Enzyme design. Structure first.
Site, PDB file in Angstrom:
ATOM      1  N   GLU A  10       0.794  -1.223   0.000  1.00  0.00           N
ATOM      2  CA  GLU A  10       0.000   0.000   0.000  1.00  0.00           C
ATOM      3  C   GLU A  10       0.829   1.277   0.000  1.00  0.00           C
ATOM      4  O   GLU A  10       0.314   2.326  -0.400  1.00  0.00           O
ATOM      5  CB  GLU A  10      -0.942   0.020   1.212  1.00  0.00           C
ATOM      6  CG  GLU A  10      -1.933  -1.135   1.241  1.00  0.00           C
ATOM      7  CD  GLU A  10      -3.062  -0.976   0.236  1.00  0.00           C
ATOM      8  OE1 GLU A  10      -3.872  -1.911   0.105  1.00  0.00           O
ATOM      9  OE2 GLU A  10      -3.153   0.085  -0.417  1.00  0.00           O
ATOM     10  N   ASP A  38      -6.450   6.448  -5.078  1.00  0.00           N
ATOM     11  CA  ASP A  38      -5.918   5.098  -5.194  1.00  0.00           C
ATOM     12  C   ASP A  38      -6.026   4.662  -6.657  1.00  0.00           C
ATOM     13  O   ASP A  38      -6.374   5.456  -7.535  1.00  0.00           O
ATOM     14  CB  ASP A  38      -6.628   4.165  -4.212  1.00  0.00           C
ATOM     15  CG  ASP A  38      -8.065   3.847  -4.611  1.00  0.00           C
ATOM     16  OD1 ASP A  38      -8.661   2.964  -3.962  1.00  0.00           O
ATOM     17  OD2 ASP A  38      -8.596   4.443  -5.572  1.00  0.00           O
TER      18      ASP A  38
END
Ligand code: MTN
Ligand code: CL
Ligand code: CL
Length: 162
Positions: A11, A20
């Protein structure tokens, strides 16, 4: 290697609001804020999550605070889910981390939809599960991360993260 280091690799860490891979507002270590396209809605969720007026920027301690909460939430979501808990219980410690990784990324409902992959994992048919897992939007949209998680399921080792 453990689940925190694994997800930190997958991440990353960003201290300012970003989008994202799907274009959703996110902060910290993959902490989804909102799927609404409004930056103001995302700043509002952020302040609510942190408990102060952030103006879209958080500290490293605050990012790791959310990270701890999100990993805890993922594990407890697995154990509360009637489709995920039996699979989790049947798995060794390394493959359990791979399942947590998937839940962290696409949520408990999304992983529970991998009905055929979950059955193959429960039966410990590792090569067949790996092929089935790759036949997914998940694999096609984030292939490098999916390959690392799938390799973890296939081998039961951390080799994809070394
Ligand atoms: S999630 C725990 C947490 C860490 C720290 C950043 C120190 N905090 O303000 C709290 C107590 C929320
Ligand atoms: Cl939260
Ligand atoms: Cl990727």
């Amino acid at each position: 290697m453990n689940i925190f280091e694994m997800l930190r690799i997958d991440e990353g860490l960003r201290l300012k609001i970003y989008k994202d891979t799907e274009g959703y507002y996110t902060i910290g270590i993959g902490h989804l804020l909102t799927k609404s396209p409004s930056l103001n809605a995302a700043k509002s969720e952020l302040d609510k999550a942190i408990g102060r007026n952030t103006n879209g920027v958080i500290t490293k301690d605050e990012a790791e605070c959310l990270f701890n909460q999100d990993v805890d939430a993922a594990v407890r979501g697995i154990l509360r889910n009637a489709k995920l808990k039996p699979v989790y219980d049947s798995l060794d410690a390394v493959r359990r981390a791979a399942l947590i990784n998937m839940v962290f990324q696409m949520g408990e409902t999304g992983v529970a939809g991998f009905t055929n992959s979950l059955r193959m994992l429960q039966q410990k048919r590792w090569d067949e599960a790996a092929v089935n897992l790759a036949k997914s939007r998940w694999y096609n949209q984030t292939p490098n991360r999916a390959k690392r998680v799938i390799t973890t399921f296939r081998t039961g080792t951390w080799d994809a993260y070394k």
